[PDB]
Write a protein that holds these residues in place. Structure first.
Motif, short mmCIF file in Angstrom:
data_model
loop_
_atom_site.label_atom_id
_atom_site.label_comp_id
_atom_site.label_asym_id
_atom_site.label_seq_id
_atom_site.Cartn_x
_atom_site.Cartn_y
_atom_site.Cartn_z
N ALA A 190 1.44 9.06 -4.48
CA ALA A 190 1.91 9.30 -3.12
C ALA A 190 2.74 8.13 -2.58
CB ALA A 190 0.73 9.60 -2.19
N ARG A 191 3.87 8.48 -1.97
CA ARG A 191 4.70 7.58 -1.17
C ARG A 191 4.27 7.58 0.29
NH1 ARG A 191 6.03 7.46 -6.00
NH2 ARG A 191 8.22 7.83 -6.70
N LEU A 192 3.62 8.69 0.69
CA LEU A 192 3.14 8.91 2.05
C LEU A 192 1.87 9.78 2.08
CD1 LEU A 192 3.71 8.64 5.22
CD2 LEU A 192 4.79 10.88 4.97
N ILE A 193 0.82 9.25 2.70
CA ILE A 193 -0.31 10.06 3.20
C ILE A 193 -0.65 9.45 4.56
CG2 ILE A 193 -2.63 11.01 2.82
CD1 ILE A 193 -2.26 10.65 -0.18
N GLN A 194 -0.35 10.20 5.62
CA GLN A 194 -0.59 9.72 6.98
C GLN A 194 -1.38 10.76 7.77
OE1 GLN A 194 2.61 9.63 9.90
NE2 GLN A 194 2.01 7.65 10.66
N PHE A 195 -2.64 10.47 8.02
CA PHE A 195 -3.45 11.31 8.90
C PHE A 195 -3.20 10.93 10.37
CE2 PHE A 195 -5.86 11.68 4.93
CZ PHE A 195 -6.22 13.02 4.94
N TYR A 196 -3.19 11.93 11.23
CA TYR A 196 -3.25 11.68 12.66
C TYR A 196 -3.95 12.79 13.39
CZ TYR A 196 1.19 14.28 12.29
OH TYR A 196 2.15 15.21 11.99
#
Length: 272
Positions: free
Chosen positions: A250-256
Protein backbone atom coordinates in the motif's frame (compact mmCIF):
# COMPACT_ATOMS: atom_id res chain seq x y z
CA UNK A 1 -24.98 11.97 6.72
CA UNK A 2 -23.02 14.35 4.46
CA UNK A 3 -19.77 13.25 2.72
CA UNK A 4 -16.76 14.83 4.48
CA UNK A 5 -14.74 17.28 2.34
CA UNK A 6 -11.85 18.17 4.72
CA UNK A 7 -8.51 18.93 2.97
CA UNK A 8 -6.66 16.39 5.18
CA UNK A 9 -8.46 13.57 3.28
CA UNK A 10 -5.85 12.28 0.77
CA UNK A 11 -7.19 11.82 -2.75
CA UNK A 12 -6.54 8.04 -3.38
CA UNK A 13 -5.75 8.67 -7.10
CA UNK A 14 -2.69 10.76 -6.12
CA UNK A 15 -0.99 8.22 -3.80
CA UNK A 16 1.22 6.57 -6.45
CA UNK A 17 4.73 6.56 -4.92
CA UNK A 18 6.36 3.51 -3.30
CA UNK A 19 6.81 4.10 0.42
CA UNK A 20 10.12 3.31 2.15
CA UNK A 21 11.45 2.09 5.47
CA UNK A 22 8.88 0.86 7.89
CA UNK A 23 8.82 -1.61 10.72
CA UNK A 24 8.41 -5.28 9.78
CA UNK A 25 6.86 -8.09 11.81
CA UNK A 26 7.49 -11.69 10.80
CA UNK A 27 5.53 -13.63 13.42
CA UNK A 28 1.96 -14.14 14.69
CA UNK A 29 1.12 -11.18 16.94
CA UNK A 30 -1.39 -12.99 19.21
CA UNK A 31 -4.17 -10.49 18.52
CA UNK A 32 -4.05 -6.71 18.20
CA UNK A 33 -0.74 -4.90 18.94
CA UNK A 34 -0.64 -1.10 19.20
CA UNK A 35 1.66 0.81 16.84
CA UNK A 36 3.93 3.50 18.26
CA UNK A 37 2.64 7.08 17.94
CA UNK A 38 -0.51 5.90 16.13
CA UNK A 39 -4.19 5.33 16.94
CA UNK A 40 -3.98 2.03 14.95
CA UNK A 41 -3.05 -1.53 15.78
CA UNK A 42 -1.83 -4.40 13.58
CA UNK A 43 -2.50 -8.11 13.65
CA UNK A 44 -0.62 -10.99 11.97
CA UNK A 45 -1.71 -14.60 11.62
CA UNK A 46 1.34 -16.49 10.36
CA UNK A 47 1.40 -20.28 10.81
CA UNK A 48 4.93 -21.57 11.63
CA UNK A 49 4.60 -24.70 9.42
CA UNK A 50 3.91 -22.31 6.55
CA UNK A 51 6.67 -20.34 4.85
CA UNK A 52 7.91 -16.79 5.48
CA UNK A 53 5.33 -14.02 5.88
CA UNK A 54 5.67 -10.33 6.81
CA UNK A 55 3.75 -7.18 7.56
CA UNK A 56 5.58 -3.86 7.28
CA UNK A 57 3.98 -0.75 8.76
CA UNK A 58 4.99 2.40 6.89
CA UNK A 59 4.61 4.53 9.99
CA UNK A 60 2.63 7.41 11.42
CA UNK A 61 3.70 10.16 9.00
CA UNK A 62 3.25 8.79 5.47
CA UNK A 63 0.66 6.94 3.38
CA UNK A 64 -2.27 8.13 5.50
CA UNK A 65 -0.86 6.53 8.63
CA UNK A 66 -2.25 3.00 8.19
CA UNK A 67 -0.30 1.97 5.04
CA UNK A 68 1.47 -1.36 5.02
CA UNK A 69 3.21 -3.96 2.84
CA UNK A 70 2.88 -7.69 3.30
CA UNK A 71 4.59 -10.75 1.76
CA UNK A 72 3.85 -14.46 1.86
CA UNK A 73 5.35 -17.70 0.55
CA UNK A 74 3.50 -20.94 1.26
CA UNK A 75 1.26 -19.36 3.88
CA UNK A 76 -1.36 -21.55 5.47
CA UNK A 77 -3.99 -18.79 5.27
CA UNK A 78 -1.94 -15.66 6.11
CA UNK A 79 -3.84 -12.62 7.43
CA UNK A 80 -2.10 -9.25 7.80
CA UNK A 81 -4.28 -6.34 8.90
CA UNK A 82 -3.98 -2.84 10.33
CA UNK A 83 -6.46 -0.16 11.43
CA UNK A 84 -8.93 0.59 14.19
CA UNK A 85 -9.00 -1.63 17.26
CA UNK A 86 -12.06 -1.07 19.45
CA UNK A 87 -13.50 -3.99 21.48
CA UNK A 88 -14.95 -1.66 24.14
CA UNK A 89 -18.62 -2.72 24.14
CA UNK A 90 -19.72 -0.02 21.69
CA UNK A 91 -21.82 -0.52 18.52
CA UNK A 92 -20.47 0.48 15.07
CA UNK A 93 -22.85 3.48 15.05
CA UNK A 94 -20.92 4.90 18.04
CA UNK A 95 -17.91 5.40 15.69
CA UNK A 96 -20.17 7.56 13.44
CA UNK A 97 -19.37 7.56 9.67
CA UNK A 98 -16.25 5.49 8.95
CA UNK A 99 -14.23 5.78 5.74
CA UNK A 100 -11.00 4.39 4.32
CA UNK A 101 -9.06 5.82 1.38
CA UNK A 102 -6.60 3.34 -0.11
CA UNK A 103 -4.15 2.79 -2.96
CA UNK A 104 -1.88 -0.27 -3.34
CA UNK A 105 0.10 -2.43 -5.74
CA UNK A 106 -0.01 -6.23 -5.45
CA UNK A 107 1.23 -9.40 -7.16
CA UNK A 108 -0.97 -10.81 -9.96
CA UNK A 109 -3.47 -13.57 -10.63
CA UNK A 110 -2.87 -16.87 -8.76
CA UNK A 111 -0.23 -15.47 -6.37
CA UNK A 112 -2.37 -16.06 -3.22
CA UNK A 113 -3.80 -19.57 -3.51
CA UNK A 114 -7.34 -20.69 -4.13
CA UNK A 115 -8.92 -18.03 -1.90
CA UNK A 116 -7.75 -14.55 -0.84
CA UNK A 117 -9.26 -11.24 0.31
CA UNK A 118 -8.33 -7.55 0.21
CA UNK A 119 -10.40 -4.82 1.91
CA UNK A 120 -11.96 -4.17 5.28
CA UNK A 121 -12.27 -6.74 8.06
CA UNK A 122 -13.23 -7.29 11.64
CA UNK A 123 -15.59 -8.83 14.16
CA UNK A 124 -18.62 -7.68 16.11
CA UNK A 125 -20.59 -9.18 18.99
CA UNK A 126 -24.35 -9.43 19.40
CA UNK A 127 -25.18 -11.00 22.80
CA UNK A 128 -28.87 -10.06 22.23
CA UNK A 129 -29.39 -12.45 19.24
CA UNK A 130 -31.76 -15.34 20.21
CA UNK A 131 -29.88 -17.72 17.87
CA UNK A 132 -26.45 -18.33 19.45
CA UNK A 133 -24.90 -18.70 15.90
CA UNK A 134 -25.61 -14.99 15.39
CA UNK A 135 -23.95 -13.74 18.59
CA UNK A 136 -20.51 -13.40 16.99
CA UNK A 137 -19.90 -11.96 13.55
CA UNK A 138 -16.80 -12.05 11.35
CA UNK A 139 -17.04 -9.45 8.54
CA UNK A 140 -15.40 -8.60 5.21
CA UNK A 141 -15.77 -5.77 2.73
CA UNK A 142 -13.94 -7.24 -0.27
CA UNK A 143 -12.46 -4.68 -2.65
CA UNK A 144 -10.16 -7.03 -4.54
CA UNK A 145 -8.50 -10.46 -4.56
CA UNK A 146 -5.85 -12.47 -6.42
CA UNK A 147 -8.31 -14.68 -8.36
CA UNK A 148 -7.40 -18.31 -8.89
CA UNK A 149 -7.07 -21.05 -11.55
CA UNK A 150 -10.85 -20.76 -12.24
CA UNK A 151 -11.45 -16.96 -12.24
CA UNK A 152 -9.48 -13.86 -13.07
CA UNK A 153 -8.57 -11.43 -10.27
CA UNK A 154 -10.60 -8.97 -12.38
CA UNK A 155 -13.77 -11.06 -11.83
CA UNK A 156 -15.43 -10.83 -8.38
CA UNK A 157 -15.38 -13.92 -6.15
CA UNK A 158 -18.69 -15.46 -5.16
CA UNK A 159 -20.20 -18.20 -2.99
CA UNK A 160 -17.72 -20.75 -4.47
CA UNK A 161 -15.03 -18.99 -2.38
CA UNK A 162 -17.05 -17.57 0.53
CA UNK A 163 -19.56 -20.37 1.05
CA UNK A 164 -23.09 -19.44 2.19
CA UNK A 165 -26.01 -17.53 0.70
CA UNK A 166 -26.45 -14.43 -1.52
CA UNK A 167 -28.82 -12.10 0.35
CA UNK A 168 -28.90 -9.23 -2.13
CA UNK A 169 -26.97 -6.31 -3.56
CA UNK A 170 -26.47 -2.55 -3.32
CA UNK A 171 -24.36 0.17 -4.97
CA UNK A 172 -21.83 2.28 -3.10
CA UNK A 173 -18.45 3.88 -3.95
CA UNK A 174 -18.88 3.33 -7.71
CA UNK A 175 -19.74 -0.39 -7.82
CA UNK A 176 -22.41 -2.90 -7.03
CA UNK A 177 -21.64 -5.13 -4.05
CA UNK A 178 -23.06 -8.57 -3.58
CA UNK A 179 -24.05 -9.32 0.05
CA UNK A 180 -23.43 -12.89 1.34
CA UNK A 181 -24.13 -14.51 4.72
CA UNK A 182 -22.24 -17.69 5.79
CA UNK A 183 -22.31 -19.80 8.95
CA UNK A 184 -19.02 -21.20 10.24
CA UNK A 185 -19.77 -24.36 12.26
CA UNK A 186 -17.35 -25.14 15.11
CA UNK A 187 -14.48 -23.10 13.65
CA UNK A 188 -11.67 -20.98 15.17
CA UNK A 189 -12.81 -17.49 16.32
CA UNK A 190 -11.92 -14.60 18.66
CA UNK A 191 -14.08 -16.50 21.16
CA UNK A 192 -12.47 -19.94 20.71
CA UNK A 193 -13.66 -22.81 18.46
CA UNK A 194 -17.41 -22.26 17.97
CA UNK A 195 -20.28 -21.56 15.58
CA UNK A 196 -20.58 -17.98 14.31
CA UNK A 197 -21.66 -16.02 11.23
CA UNK A 198 -19.80 -14.20 8.48
CA UNK A 199 -21.05 -11.20 6.52
CA UNK A 200 -19.47 -10.27 3.17
CA UNK A 201 -19.84 -7.40 0.75
CA UNK A 202 -18.16 -8.41 -2.52
CA UNK A 203 -17.21 -5.52 -4.85
CA UNK A 204 -18.39 -6.47 -8.34
CA UNK A 205 -15.68 -4.31 -9.95
CA UNK A 206 -12.38 -5.15 -8.12
CA UNK A 207 -10.07 -2.18 -7.68
CA UNK A 208 -6.74 -1.32 -6.09
CA UNK A 209 -7.48 2.32 -5.10
CA UNK A 210 -10.50 4.33 -3.93
CA UNK A 211 -12.61 5.17 -0.88
CA UNK A 212 -14.70 2.70 1.13
CA UNK A 213 -17.80 4.04 2.83
CA UNK A 214 -17.55 1.41 5.54
CA UNK A 215 -20.56 2.50 7.67
CA UNK A 216 -22.80 2.17 4.58
CA UNK A 217 -21.98 -1.54 4.44
CA UNK A 218 -22.82 -1.93 8.16
CA UNK A 219 -26.18 -0.09 7.68
CA UNK A 220 -27.00 -2.26 4.65
CA UNK A 221 -26.24 -5.59 6.38
CA UNK A 222 -28.42 -4.65 9.36
CA UNK A 223 -31.18 -3.47 7.03
CA UNK A 224 -31.15 -6.98 5.42
CA UNK A 225 -31.43 -8.58 8.90
CA UNK A 226 -27.70 -9.33 9.18
CA UNK A 227 -27.32 -7.68 12.61
CA UNK A 228 -23.94 -6.67 14.01
CA UNK A 229 -24.97 -6.13 17.65
CA UNK A 230 -23.58 -3.64 20.12
CA UNK A 231 -19.86 -4.43 20.55
CA UNK A 232 -17.60 -3.93 17.53
CA UNK A 233 -14.17 -5.51 17.90
CA UNK A 234 -12.16 -3.78 15.16
CA UNK A 235 -12.22 -2.26 11.72
CA UNK A 236 -8.98 -2.90 9.81
CA UNK A 237 -7.53 -3.06 6.32
CA UNK A 238 -6.80 -6.71 5.46
CA UNK A 239 -4.77 -8.85 3.11
CA UNK A 240 -5.56 -12.58 3.37
CA UNK A 241 -3.73 -15.20 1.25
CA UNK A 242 -4.69 -18.88 1.30
CA UNK A 243 -1.43 -20.06 -0.29
CA UNK A 244 0.95 -19.12 -3.11
CA UNK A 245 3.72 -16.56 -3.14
CA UNK A 246 2.97 -12.86 -3.47
CA UNK A 247 2.90 -9.31 -2.13
CA UNK A 248 0.63 -6.43 -1.16
CA UNK A 249 2.16 -2.97 -0.98
CA UNK A 250 0.00 0.00 0.00
CA UNK A 251 0.97 3.58 -0.90
CA UNK A 252 -2.13 4.78 1.00
CA UNK A 253 -4.36 3.47 3.79
CA UNK A 254 -6.11 6.37 5.52
CA UNK A 255 -9.00 5.79 7.92
CA UNK A 256 -11.22 8.67 8.95
CA UNK A 257 -14.45 9.19 10.83
CA UNK A 258 -16.92 12.05 10.45
CA UNK A 259 -20.15 13.08 12.18
CA UNK A 260 -23.46 13.32 10.28
CA UNK A 261 -22.71 16.88 9.14
CA UNK A 262 -19.40 15.72 7.63
CA UNK A 263 -17.11 17.13 10.28
CA UNK A 264 -13.95 15.09 10.83
CA UNK A 265 -13.81 13.40 14.24
CA UNK A 266 -10.72 11.34 13.57
CA UNK A 267 -8.14 11.35 10.79
CA UNK A 268 -4.45 10.42 10.37
CA UNK A 269 -1.74 11.68 10.16
CA UNK A 270 -1.69 14.38 12.90
CA UNK A 271 2.61 24.88 6.78
CA UNK A 272 2.59 28.72 7.11
Amino acid sequence: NNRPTDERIIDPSTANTQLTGGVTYNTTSGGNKPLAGSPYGYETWIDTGGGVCSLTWYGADQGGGAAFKATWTNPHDFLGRLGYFWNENKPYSHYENIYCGFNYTRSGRKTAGDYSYIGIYGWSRNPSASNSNERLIEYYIVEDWFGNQWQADTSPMGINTTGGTVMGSFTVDGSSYQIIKNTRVNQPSIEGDKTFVQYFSIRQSPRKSGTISITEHFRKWERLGMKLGDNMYECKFLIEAGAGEGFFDARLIQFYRADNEGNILQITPLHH
